[model samples]
Target: VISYDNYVTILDEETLKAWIAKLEKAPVFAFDTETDSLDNISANLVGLSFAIEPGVAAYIPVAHDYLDAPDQISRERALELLKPLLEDEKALKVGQNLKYDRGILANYGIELRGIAFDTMLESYILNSVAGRHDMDSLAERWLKHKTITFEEIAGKGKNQLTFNQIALEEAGRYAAEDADVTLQLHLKMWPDLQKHKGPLNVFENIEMPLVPVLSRIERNGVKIDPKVLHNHSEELTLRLAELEKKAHEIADYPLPKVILEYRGLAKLKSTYTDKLPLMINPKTGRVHTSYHQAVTATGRLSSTDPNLQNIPVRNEEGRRIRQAFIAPEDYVIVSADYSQIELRIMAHLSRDKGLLTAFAEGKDIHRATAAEVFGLPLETVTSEQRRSAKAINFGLIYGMSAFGLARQLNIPRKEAQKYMDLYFERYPGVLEYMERTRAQAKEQGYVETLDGRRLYLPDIKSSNGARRAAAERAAINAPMQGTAADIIKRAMIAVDAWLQAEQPRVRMIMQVHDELVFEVHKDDVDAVAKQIHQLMENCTRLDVPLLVEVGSGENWDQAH
Candidate 1:
């Protein structure tokens, strides 16, 4: 059914015009781009393919240039004819991965606005890992067809041709089949997703809209000052010298101490202080980090090419690296972070009377837990008691053992085990929820986040206790982590739309962990800070209140 015979080559203006007319009338169609390179910012659009029916597809070659090639429509000319339909918000378009297509089309002054569905996301929203979500993988699994590989047409080596050099006939078939498969894959995956209410809500309301929002954020890269970086680099040398001198006078024991500090600073210097400036793009002059979707099984995002996620927060030396993340002139850095987000998420999920009351009353979570577990008044709880309770609170989320908690708290295992028992006695709902979740995970071999992003854990029922327990731990932890991810994504999409129209000067430039960072106008800094906090806090609701803490300054360190 997916064979190459049902394809038309759009070589002339008339052909493209007729194709666009048909596509414009259809409620939805799938389209894909053929590019010379994978770099969305720089890749030249070589051709495009579209599909309306299950087997119907067409390829419009605008830039193929092999020997004895047929006359192709000029790139700009083809886009001119195709622009109206692609840009029409009423005329929906579907695609495999439209982020690439959307980002590339921006280079030609076209904003690709009408998005109906993305099949890659269709598969991911249904299940995080069934197989890879690439079209070939999706087609083979869902439609029982093998797609023509890019390498198959362009030879598989260093000397392989770019898409423009591939013969149009071969390129056309490959491109056409891709669009057809994408539409088929969407149709195939959608019904399965709809069978579950949560995943359906996740796809249409959360993930689909976030596609364009993330595309905009990706294009709006963050500004970093190399001067601040160099200044910190020099300052670290003096601190290292002082520590090295002190270590010599102290003893050989202090020698190991310096090694710990040395590793920390050296890594900061390499990962951020030295490597970041070079990561800045020449065209934008800002360091752009590509946020990867569908990479983490827990539904969180990951970054590459100078990852912003791993930047340290505990040490003063490491936190100084954030100083290099500066704002443009007249703009201030703003950081809005969720306060005790995971603990609050846990409170919502468990519905424990103690946990929910503590959050509802806005009490310090650790202190509240300390009092609850220690059988003491809130004010009488000591720091050490709160520390022990803090360990239990996070520990339970990860399904940590008494032995693990004992090691973390530097207490006896018997004491640690007693505290865990007391914790459950005081907050019995959490214990019930944990047992229920583990049983359900074992039965289903998978767990869904609060937003319905499924994390498949095949080893949940493993005969080996270790593997089964690990999966159980993941089952308990992932909902909190995945829920946190979903909340932030929702916050971003909402905040981005608000920033687009209302607070134009406040550009949200970073999303590292549980925080959203914005570069704001100095004049409206306080107002925007309050606005961001409200928007983020209002993104979702639960049994317990959601809270966001906001700060603003000249640099990321100051704001953080």
Candidate 2:
């Protein structure tokens, strides 16, 4: 083992060549990069670093042009020397957030093969609920050492220096320490992941393979019509003003509805119309949203840089914005979304006869619930009763109380509680599932999904009533949500594998919640849709049937 404080700074050609030779021979090594900017597409690589042994690493400064910096290997020469080693399938490369580095390496014309481990994800799998998983935080928590921070060498705020502009002495140390710390963390965390069956399966089977697939989807990007967005924004603005006036008239003063409508339109203008065009990459002429694997507590993937998942879906105006996401010429947009996935999951978990029988008999679930709760025949259930039943079905998984349900349906709390009681009376097993889940969570301080992925509820046993209740709600919900996440991930992996093997003339461009969007050729739409539906629905086995709804159109709204 090497000391954490010790590392080599390879500045000259001779030293760089020697270090590359050693790295090429190592079975596995840790990689890190110092870049000029945060945007992966536009960022310029300042230097690269590597670690072959615990606490020992080398930094090669290829682009440091700061004043009086010593001569270093040229950027072209450094990449040329390192390319073969990076591409070698037999030599594994480990890093923190390897996807970012992979994107950076793509800019340099390297594909960055042989990624075997990522320390950031390792810690995430070990215990995602445990604080932050970034290098600085992990080093302090796991290794009991404080590594160098970017702000330590580069001044903060307006005076901050890019990595290329930083002096070589400070840049080399900061970058080299990252690789050293990453390797040391891997040394400490990998065994812990191996020892645990649930996390080990999730890490090795689900997360590892999905990294490259997500990278490809991100790079594929999505086309958006800015003109469509602009038109929608204008229409929304006019409607919002009318709504504000109406709300003010109804209240005799400016009320919450006015503020709510105004904010909705403002957010639509900013998030979709005003901000999206700026995020479109000039090179690809499309928007590339980064998919984050570590951010969500329920294992769901999230997107930033124009969040596709957060786009409004319930309202007509918001749904119109989906028109902006159009396919290119000669291609059509295909969207395959899981139908009532969470409810089906609830059925499987609770093993409730009414819910299972409704799904099994192909009955409309909410309408069936309405028939049971309202004491009517299936055909006699009214729309209003069905709507209330719909609210109950969705709300209960989230542990919604009568107060919450009352607000949603604009009904009295007593009526809401009556509906809930009727729902439980009709489906006793769902109530049983909720109570058992809460008790187990309080007893164990954690909950597991269907596949055994654990989420720790720190406040499940808290003395505070509100906090403990919130935790209990999460405990009941996390299993279903987390299992849904796992199932979709499994689908992505399966679909990507099939696409690669078949070499389809389609690109899987976006994944939002339980849906996958693709741009497919018009000639191949029928065949591809069937294939996608099969893959998505059969990705995992469950007691209840998994149903996928597929549609195709020139634009997203039409397809959905």
Best by lDDT: 2
lDDT of candidate 1 at residue 511, scale 0 to 100: 88
Candidate 1: Cα lDDT at 20: 82
| Candidate 1 residue-wise lDDT, 1-560, digit = tens | 23346798888887778888888888789989999987677689999999998888999988887787899999998888888888988888889888888988988999898887999888888778677878888888998888889888899889999999988888989999889889998888878888988889888888888888777777778898888888888887777787777777776466788878877887788778888887788788888778877667787877787688888887786677888889899999999999888888888788887898898887999999999888899999999999999999889877786688988888576888899889989999888889888878988878877777778888888889675678888988888888888998889988988876775687878788999988999998878887788888876654446889898888999999
lDDT of 2 by residue, 409-429 (tens): 886778888888888998999
- Model 1, residue 447: C-alpha shift (Å): 2.9
